[PDB]
């Protein structure tokens, strides 16, 4: 049961890191495009 | 026991990815601000 609870919590952690990576990808893409346009 | 050891190691991996995401967030923010200031 502790292991099940650990995996559950770790899945939440993973989802948070996915959110973060998606945010950063959009932001760096926006910067790359800004520099290209300039 | 193998599963416990796997979860332990995976938690270390997750912590490393969190470190990396935090580094990248600060770096892209620094770049965004640099461009704004310029």
């Amino acid at each position: 049961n502790n292991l099940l609870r650990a995996i559950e919590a770790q899945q939440h952690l993973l989802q948070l890191t996915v959110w973060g990576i998606k945010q950063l990808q959009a932001r760096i893409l926006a910067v790359e495009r800004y520099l290209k346009d300039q | 026991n193998n599963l416990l050891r796997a979860i332990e190691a995976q938690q270390h991996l997750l912590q490393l990815t969190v470190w990396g995401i935090k580094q990248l967030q600060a770096r892209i923010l620094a770049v965004e601000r640099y461009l704004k200031d310029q």
Partner: peptide, 28 residues
């Protein structure tokens, strides 16, 4: 949605602390 980087930090830390406890309790 409502997610901000400070909230992200908070939630990461809370889940990490819980997992540490769960893994340790299992050590026992």
């Amino acid at each position: 949605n409502n997610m901000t980087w400070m909230e992200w930090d908070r939630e990461i830390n809370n889940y990490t602390s819980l997992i540490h406890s769960l893994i340790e309790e299992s050590q026992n």
